[PDB]
Amino acid sequence: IGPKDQRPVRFDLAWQQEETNRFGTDEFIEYCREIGAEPYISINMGTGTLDEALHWLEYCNGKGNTYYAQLRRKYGHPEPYNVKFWGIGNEMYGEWQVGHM
Amino acid sequence: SYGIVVDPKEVVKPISRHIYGHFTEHLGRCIYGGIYEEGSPLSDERGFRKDVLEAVKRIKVPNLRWPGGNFVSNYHWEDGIGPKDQRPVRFDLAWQQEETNRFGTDEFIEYCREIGAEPYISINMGTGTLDEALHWLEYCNGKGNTYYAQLRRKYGHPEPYNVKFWGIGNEMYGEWQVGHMTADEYARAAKEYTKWMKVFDPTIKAIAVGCDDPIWNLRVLQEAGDVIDFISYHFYTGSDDYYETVSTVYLLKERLIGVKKLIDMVDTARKRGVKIALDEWNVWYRVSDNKLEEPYDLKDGIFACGVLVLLQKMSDIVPLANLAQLVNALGAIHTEKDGLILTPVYKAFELIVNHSGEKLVKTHVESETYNIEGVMFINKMPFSVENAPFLDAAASISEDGKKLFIAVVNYRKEDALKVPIRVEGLGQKKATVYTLTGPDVNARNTMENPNVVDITSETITVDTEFEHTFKPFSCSVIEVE
Amino acid sequence: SYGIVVDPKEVVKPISRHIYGHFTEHLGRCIYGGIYEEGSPLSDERGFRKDVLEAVKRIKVPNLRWPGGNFVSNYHWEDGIGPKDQRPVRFDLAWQQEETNRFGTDEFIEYCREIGAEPYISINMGTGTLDEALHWLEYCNGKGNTYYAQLRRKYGHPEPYNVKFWGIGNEMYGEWQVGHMTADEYARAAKEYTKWMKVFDPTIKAIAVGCDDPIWNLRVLQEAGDVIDFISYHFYTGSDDYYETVSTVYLLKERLIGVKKLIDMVDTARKRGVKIALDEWNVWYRVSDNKLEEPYDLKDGIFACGVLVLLQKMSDIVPLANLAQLVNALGAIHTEKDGLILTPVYKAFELIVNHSGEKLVKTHVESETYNIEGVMFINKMPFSVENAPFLDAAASISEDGKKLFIAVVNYRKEDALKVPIRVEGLGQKKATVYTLTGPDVNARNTMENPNVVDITSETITVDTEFEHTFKPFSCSVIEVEL
Numbered sequence A: 001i002g003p004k005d006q007r008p009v010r011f012d013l014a015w016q017q018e019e020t021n022r023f024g025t026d027e028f029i030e031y032c033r034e035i036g037a038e039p040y041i042s043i044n045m046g047t048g049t050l051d052e053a054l055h056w057l058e059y060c061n062g063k064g065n066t067y068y069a070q071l072r073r074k075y076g077h078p079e080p081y082n083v084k085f086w087g088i089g090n091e092m093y094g095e096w097q098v099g100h101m
Numbered sequence B: 001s002y003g004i005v006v007d008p009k010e011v012v013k014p015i016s017r018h019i020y021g022h023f024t025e026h027l028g029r030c031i032y033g034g035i036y037e038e039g040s041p042l043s044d045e046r047g048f049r050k051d052v053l054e055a056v057k058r059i060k061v062p063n064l065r066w067p068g069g070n071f072v073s074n075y076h077w078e079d080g081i082g083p084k085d086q087r088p089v090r091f092d093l094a095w096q097q098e099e100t101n102r103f104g105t106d107e108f109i110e111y112c113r114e115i116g117a118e119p120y121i122s123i124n125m126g127t128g129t130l131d132e133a134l135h136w137l138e139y140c141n142g143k144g145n146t147y148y149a150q151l152r153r154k155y156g157h158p159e160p161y162n163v164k165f166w167g168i169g170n171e172m173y174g175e176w177q178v179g180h181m182t183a184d185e186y187a188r189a190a191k192e193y194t195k196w197m198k199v200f201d202p203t204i205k206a207i208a209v210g211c212d213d214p215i216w217n218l219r220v221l222q223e224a225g226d227v228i229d230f231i232s233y234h235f236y237t238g239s240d241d242y243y244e245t246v247s248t249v250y251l252l253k254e255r256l257i258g259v260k261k262l263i264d265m266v267d268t269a270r271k272r273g274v275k276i277a278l279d280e281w282n283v284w285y286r287v288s289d290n291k292l293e294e295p296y297d298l299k300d301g302i303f304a305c306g307v308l309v310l311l312q313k314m315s316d317i318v319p320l321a322n323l324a325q326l327v328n329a330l331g332a333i334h335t336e337k338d339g340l341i342l343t344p345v346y347k348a349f350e351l352i353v354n355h356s357g358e359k360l361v362k363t364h365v366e367s368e369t370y371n372i373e374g375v376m377f378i379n380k381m382p383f384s385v386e387n388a389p390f391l392d393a394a395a396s397i398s399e400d401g402k403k404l405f406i407a408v409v410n411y412r413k414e415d416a417l418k419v420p421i422r423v424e425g426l427g428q429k430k431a432t433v434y435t436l437t438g439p440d441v442n443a444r445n446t447m448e449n450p451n452v453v454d455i456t457s458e459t460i461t462v463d464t465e466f467e468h469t470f471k472p473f474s475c476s477v478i479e480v481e
Numbered sequence C: 001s002y003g004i005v006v007d008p009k010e011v012v013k014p015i016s017r018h019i020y021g022h023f024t025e026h027l028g029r030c031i032y033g034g035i036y037e038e039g040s041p042l043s044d045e046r047g048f049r050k051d052v053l054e055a056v057k058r059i060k061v062p063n064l065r066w067p068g069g070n071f072v073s074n075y076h077w078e079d080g081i082g083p084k085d086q087r088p089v090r091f092d093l094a095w096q097q098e099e100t101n102r103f104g105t106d107e108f109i110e111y112c113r114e115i116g117a118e119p120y121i122s123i124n125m126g127t128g129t130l131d132e133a134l135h136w137l138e139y140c141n142g143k144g145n146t147y148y149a150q151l152r153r154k155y156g157h158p159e160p161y162n163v164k165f166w167g168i169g170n171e172m173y174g175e176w177q178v179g180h181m182t183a184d185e186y187a188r189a190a191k192e193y194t195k196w197m198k199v200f201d202p203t204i205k206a207i208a209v210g211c212d213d214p215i216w217n218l219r220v221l222q223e224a225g226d227v228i229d230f231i232s233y234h235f236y237t238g239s240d241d242y243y244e245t246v247s248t249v250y251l252l253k254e255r256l257i258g259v260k261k262l263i264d265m266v267d268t269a270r271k272r273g274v275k276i277a278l279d280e281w282n283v284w285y286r287v288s289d290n291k292l293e294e295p296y297d298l299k300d301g302i303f304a305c306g307v308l309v310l311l312q313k314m315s316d317i318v319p320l321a322n323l324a325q326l327v328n329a330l331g332a333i334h335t336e337k338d339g340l341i342l343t344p345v346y347k348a349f350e351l352i353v354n355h356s357g358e359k360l361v362k363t364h365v366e367s368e369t370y371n372i373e374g375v376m377f378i379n380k381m382p383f384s385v386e387n388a389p390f391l392d393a394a395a396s397i398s399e400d401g402k403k404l405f406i407a408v409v410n411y412r413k414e415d416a417l418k419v420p421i422r423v424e425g426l427g428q429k430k431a432t433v434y435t436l437t438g439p440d441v442n443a444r445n446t447m448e449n450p451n452v453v454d455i456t457s458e459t460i461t462v463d464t465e466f467e468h469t470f471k472p473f474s475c476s477v478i479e480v481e482l
C-alpha cells in the first residue's frame, strides 16, 4: 500500500520470487471494480497476526476515524471497499505452507 | 606399555579445519572491553583492540560464533545496524547489562574479515520470529533487490557477506533461556526456521540445538533431520583436581559417541549425514556471575590440548567445534585496560593450530590407562571415566604431503614418559619438537610474567624408530620433514 | 595387511558364559517332533528325543529360553502343569496351532536339568496378568508354604527350580504380538511386573523388551531402569548374497553399541549397570510361514561364527544371548521322524563352545576392510556397513590359564589367507587347529550326507611368531597349551 515507489521488495517463500508489491490491496480492489467482481481476500495466518488481519479489515471496511480507515482515505479512497468474503488462512494443514498448523 | 606407531602413507580421513573454531558472546567483557573498545589507546579506529587482534590472528580462527549464547535469545539484530549513534540501548535479560548495540552485525562481519574467520551467526528463537531470522539472512546473504539486501548496501557493503553457518537457536531446552521450549516445540520450530531459511539460501549450513536429554535430541533429529546439517552439544567441565579435569576429555569422547549413535537411530538424519557441532566447550567451574572471568591454569590448558587431539581423530563425526569463549568470558585471552594475558587454554590453540596437518594418518598408541570418579562444572556434578589413557596422540600430514605432525599429550601428572616411536618408512632426519608445559599443573600467565606457560622448541634427530621423553602435564608436536 | 597379535598375559575382561544361550519356542516342530516326541523309537521314557539330546549336550547350553517368542504372549502357564491327560488343548494365536500342553513347565525344567542349562522363562504380558506371572514365579522358585510352591511339590518336585532369568514380556512393541502395547504402556507395565516379582524373589534377573525404536528403548530404561537387569534386542538377518549376509555381524555390532549408549544416557540404568540381552538372533530371510524351517547353509554358519566372536569381544555389554532357535524353527538342528541334521549354524556353536576360554586376552587384528550396501531379513530391508573386516579374531584363555584359544574368522569369499600370528612369550610347540569349513558358501548338511559341512582338526607347530593358512568362508580355533 501507499506510493508504489516506496513499497518494499520482498522475497516470497512460496514461489521463490522477488515481489515488488506494485500490485497491492488498492490495485486489486480497483481491478475488482473494473470487472464488477466482489473481492475475496485471504489473510496471512502463517507469518501474520490477529492485529495484522484486523488492520487489513479496518483498512478495507472501516467507516470511522481509526488509523487504517483514515489511511485508506489518505491513499485516495474515502469510501470503504466493503470486502464481504474473507479467507481465514490458506491450506494451513499442509507442511508446504509457511507456519502450517 | 607405552608407544606410538605412525604410518604417514595411510591417510585415515581429512581433518575438518572447523574443529578449531571460536565464539564471542555479548557477555561481560567479551565484546565490550574484550575484542571491541572504543577509545582504548590499544584499539584501532574501528574500535578493535589491536593487541587482541594480533593474538587472534596467531591462532588462525576458521570460524567465529556470535552473538550468543544466552544473549541471542533476547537479541533483535536490527537494533545493531545503521549509524551507531541511532542504535537503541537495550536491556539484555541474559546477563543483565545495558547493551548499546555499538558492536552489531556489520562490525562483527568486519571483525571476521580482519581475522580471516568464517562468520557463524546464531539466531534468536526466544523473542525472535521466522520473519526476523529470514531478514537477517537476507541482509547478510541477499544479492537481489529485496529490502534487506539493499539495506546492507545502503549501510556500506554492496557485496553479500555469505554467512555459511547459522545456529538455529541457543540452548532452547534450558529454563534459563528467554522463551525456552519443550522438545516437541523446539523440534517443530527448528524444522520451520531451517526449511524456510534454506528456501532463501540453500547453501547455508544449519546447526540445531542438542543437549544431554536423549529424548530432546531424538525429537530434533526426527522432526528436522531432513533439513539440518548439525546437532549441537555444549560441554563444560573441570574441578580443582588435575586428573578430574583432564580425564574428562574421555568423558567428552563418550558423550560425542552417544550423540552420533542417536543420529544413527534416525533414518532421515543418518542418510543425510547429519553431524555434531561441539559449538560451546571449555573448562568452567570456578566462577558463577555475569562476567565468567575463569582463571585458567595449565591443568585447564592440558584439557584443551586433549580435546583438540580428540577432535583431530573424530572430526568426521564432529566437524565443527567452538571454544567458549575467545576473550574474557570463559576467556582464552584475558584483557585489562593496558594489556592482555594469553591463558594456557589459548596456548593449546597456539600450539596445535600452528603445528597440525589437514589429513589424519594412521596412528596406533600403546598406553597405560586409569579409571576415575570425580566432579565437574559449576554444580560439581559427579562423573566417572573408565580407561582414560595417560598418553594420547594423533599424527597428521600437510595437504601437500611434505610435513608430518605428531601431536602427543602426556597427561601423567607425576612422571615424564620415555616413549618409543615408530614412523613407517621414515629416513633419518632432524625434526622440531614444540612443547607446551609449565612449572606445575596450576601455573598461569600474568601481565608481568606472560610466559610462565608457553611453547618452547628443541631440535631432535628422528628415524623410522626413535625415542623421545615427554614431560609430565605437557602437550608436544613433533614436526617432521 | 593381515596379521594377528595376541598377548596371553594381558586379560582384558571375563567372557560371560551366557553368550552361548539357546531358545526353544512352541513354534512348528521345535518342541513337538523336535526336542520332544512322545512314543518315538528315538525318544526316552520322558519323551525326549535322544539323538537331539546328544547333539544338544555336545554344545554345552548355558541357558535355555522358553516358551516364546510370540507364543508366550497368549500362553497361560497353568495350562501346562499337572497330570498330562488333564491339560487342556489350546489354540495358539501366534502360530495358529492346537497346543496340547503336554510339554509344560515341569518338562521344560527337566529338559534344562538333563542338558545342564539354566532355565530362562519369558512371561505372558499379552493376555497374562501380574498375579499370573507371580504365580509362575512362586511355582518355580517358592520354598515356603504358599499354594503354588506346594503345587510344585504335589506334582513331584519338592526342591524349587530356582529359575534365575525372567523375560518381562516378548516383542510387546509389535502389532503382531497378542496384546501389544505402546512404549509408555509397556514401560509402565515392565516396571510393575519387575518390581513385584522381585519383592517375591529379589535374586531373579529381569530382561525387559527393547527394539530398534530409540524412544521405546528410552521409555523402558527411564521408567524401569531402577529394577530391570537387561534390555533385550532381537536381530534377524541375511540375504542370498554371501557378503550381504556375513557383513551384518558388523551391523549388529553398531546396533549393540547404540543400545549400550542409550543405557548410558539414563542415569538409573547406567548406575545400575543394566546390560543388553541379545535374546533372539539368527539368519532368517527365506521362509515366512508357521514352521520357519530355514535351510541354513555355510554362509549362515559363518555369520553365526562371526557373532560368537563378536560376543566374546563384547560380553561385558551383552552378557546374555540366545540363538533363535535350537530345533526346527529357525533351527540349528533339523529333525525328521527317523534322524536329524546338524546345520552349519549348529556347527558354529559346536566349534566355539568347545574351544573357547573364560577370559578374553589382548588381541590386535590387522585386516583389509570393505563397505557394503545390501538387504536383510524376510522383508529385504536395506542396510549398509562401513569398513567390515575380511578377517577377525578373538583370543581367550581358560580359567586355570593352561589353554589359549585363538578364534579366527576368514570372511573372504574366494581366497584363503596366509596370516602371520604373534603370541607373546609362547614357546616352540605343537597345537591343534579346529576348522569349520565346507566346499562352497551354499553348502549344507543333509540326512544322506550329514558331514558336508563339518569341523576338521589338524596339528600345527606354533611359536612366538608363526603362520597359518585360513580357508575362505571359514572359522578356526587354534588351541594351544600354555
Ligand code: NA
Residues within 6 Å of the ligand: C202, C203, C204, C205
Ligand atoms: Na539382582
